[PDB]
Design a protein around this ligand. Structure first.
Ligand SMILES: C[C@@H]1O[C@@H](O[C@@H]2[C@@H](O)[C@H](O)[C@@H](CO)O[C@H]2O)C[C@](C)(N)[C@@H]1O
Ligand SMILES: C[C@@H]1O[C@@H](O[C@@H]2[C@@H](O)[C@H](O)[C@@H](CO)O[C@H]2O)C[C@](C)(N)[C@@H]1O
Lengths: 7, 7
């Protein structure tokens, strides 16, 4: 992954 | 805050 969030 | 990221 490598992105973050939270969704 | 309360959301996430990272920007
Ligand atoms: C911001 C980030 O926090 C840690 O990564 C988190 C990871 O431990 C956790 O399992 C997932 C899912 O809740 O959320 C990530 O944000 C470590 C990092 C990547 N070094 C960074 O500080
Ligand atoms: C506020 C934030 O806390 C840390 O990052 C969090 C990470 O440890 C955690 O696993 C995820 C999901 O619960 O949320 C992240 O925000 C480190 C940061 C990004 N430096 C920051 O202090």
């Amino acid at each position: 992954x490598x992105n973050x969030x939270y969704x």
